[PDB]
Amino acid sequence: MRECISIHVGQAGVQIGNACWELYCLEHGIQPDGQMPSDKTIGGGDDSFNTFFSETGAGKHVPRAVFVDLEPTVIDEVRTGTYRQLFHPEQLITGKEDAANNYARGHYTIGKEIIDLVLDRIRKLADQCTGLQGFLVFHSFGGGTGSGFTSLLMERLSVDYGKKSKLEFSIYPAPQVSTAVVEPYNSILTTHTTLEHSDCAFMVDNEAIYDICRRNLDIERPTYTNLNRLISQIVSSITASLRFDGALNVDLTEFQTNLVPYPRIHFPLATYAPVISAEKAYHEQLSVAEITNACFEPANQMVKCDPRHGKYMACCLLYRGDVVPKDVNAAIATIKTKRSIQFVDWCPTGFKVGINYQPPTVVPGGDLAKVQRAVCMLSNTTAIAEAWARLDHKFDLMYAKRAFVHWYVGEGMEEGEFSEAREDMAALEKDYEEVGVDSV
Template identity: 45%
Template sequence: MGEIINVFVGQFGVQSGYEYWQQICLEHNINSYGEKLTQEQDNKENVTCFFNESEKQKYVPRCVFLDLDSTPIDEIRKSSSNFFRKDCLISGKEDCGSNYVRGKYTIGREVCNITLDQIRLESDKCDNLQGFIIHRSINGGTGAGVGNLIADRLSIDYNKKVKINSLLFPSNNIANEVVEPFNFVLGMHDILNNLDMSIMFQNEQIYQFVDNFLDIEQLDYQNVNQLISIISSSLTYSMRFGGDLNYNMANLLTNLVCYPRINNIIPSYSSSYLNFIKEKSGQPTINMLCSSLFNKQNFLVDCNPEQDKYLSCCLTARGDIYPRQMSESIKTLKSRKSIDFVDYIPTGIKVGICQKLPKNVFFQEYESKFQRDAILLANNTSISSIYLIMAEKFDKLYAKRAFVHWYVGEGMESDEFSCAREDLQALIKDYEEVSIEANQSYNEDD
């Protein structure tokens, strides 16, 4: 299938990246020293997708961690010094202070060059590099600013390779940074031009997901990052383990992104864990499992797909599931009126199936009850509602020129605010036009 390089940028990227590798190691039976715990050889397992195998028969993660604040990186250096290579853990001397411009134009540049050199070393070890997954937040300065700086360079140096974001979006009703709207709008302006696809998450919706399905009284960021790591690792599950229906990064991109700019994907998750923990019931049927993926409460982004149009989806099922069962489930899903696909994309759903039983760092105590799960990646026009909310917040701040001096003082032209805002408005209009065209076609058919 080929190799993938993971890049983790900023505090969210680094902290979620640590949980991400815990999940990956659990799935591949690799311990904290990079050693295989079982000697059984699975011919369908592709360990080298994410790992380099050393001469001492140890598996070394193919990744790079970067944060301008050294604290999160230092924590990984202390806890996982035997697992990650030291030169893959890169930290700066000064934080960018939640300022997008400081991350992209000033203090982020020097560290970015070091990171790109390390990425180049990792890519040279690959026989068939598929692409890159960049894990970061667009709320702060490092993830948005330095992350986009890295993405810009990757789009030039590795033009033919797939580049995917695993991206934390600002929540609709809560915020960790006052200047989130500025970082978001400026960050989105670059993301639209240098990345092929983004998988989106929101903390607020993850809190709601946990309230709906899990018994966790005091939710912390580690729990949030663990849940995100389940979805992020599932993105590549079919590439790392064989099954009846596999796909690689290029297949995923081709089937999900029908227009270049409409490439922000919302994830949904469902598993037999959730059934067992909350409802105390037995294994859900495959129809139940797949159907629940399209419920609003299963999505990890705060929007309502049921009220808008689906352009395309990728449904990955893991566990004791077979193609004929999935075909019947997909047929049932398409008959539901609440799942509304645009009429000019007749198939709509790409399916991936892997019979290997899923493992999960979140619910290991229930592993005997965990026989199957499913992940949905949906390209749905409802995501434009988040853009509208962030555009309104941006307009309120920018109308009074609040906090603008911090950005202009770092060397950015004030016109860039207006340019980025216009680009976001153009994206909102793109989504509106897709919805209008789909509704017109539907009315003509009626």
């Protein structure tokens, strides 16, 4: 059976893990105590689909996930919370301090003494798999553990495993909003190191979801328990092809090909069109044509980046529910007739389609509505350079005076590792420039 490993790192990933497994457990029919009475009443089945949940003899289904951190104060909401009887007690959480918004502290200093234990429990879950498809890493630029440890771990996995797809779901640092004065340093050092190892790193910006939650869902005072259910839907729309039956099923290796032309431009953006409240769930048709055009609407992009300042190199669409292909080809034709959507000349196709039959569910206590169709658009745009440059300029301003550097050197880091990283960040911005230029 086809399987995927879900690695969760730092506070930003763990709190998304709780939101993803709240959703996976609901769709298949699992209670928080690991049980699935459906097979007790039916007489067995693969409904507890083995891609994400492994099975024991007592009927308990354990998730294929690992929940790393350096703070105890985050995991201990899990070991004491609703889902304590689901996860293996091996959660790999360090009885020491955090990284204190420091790459050098998460990469080397207090990233070692832990990494070997993390890399074994990953090995144990992989030896239990009869054909592994890839990894799914959840972290956030801005911290030490989501920057450092994720750059330490992805290096070791490129050695031992090598050929398996290693995907990232990352919280891009926003331009105006931010919870740390040293997000840029921890972000530009990360891309220097992951860019050679990861294969496709989907990016989201917390600021865009804050706006998406205001315009559409009408939530003026959101929390992180509202952003992350909406992120949990992106991951499910990706991993649905491995779990449920469908007409066109897009595995992991197919995202890695259609969306990544050259090895260094694997930074696409995600979104989800039918963000509709219960009240506005009526008064809407919610057709493929209405849902599909909205994925290109800049307001509904989950990264603050106007696509109209750039060009699309590749775009993958993942439909769900009562979706008929003829309605999709009509849509993709309607998008190529427009002129605010300018593609590259070297990708006249541009598009990919995936269709499933299992509609999305509704996590109770939430805000999203019961819609019968859904879309997840994964786009590779040249616009995202404007975000790279905005971060680099923040880096060059406060690095010239060597502000906040001694906290990095004090954990083991050379001054030239900034500059080297800076050069790496100044290249990539030329590659996104060159590839977007029209050929002769």
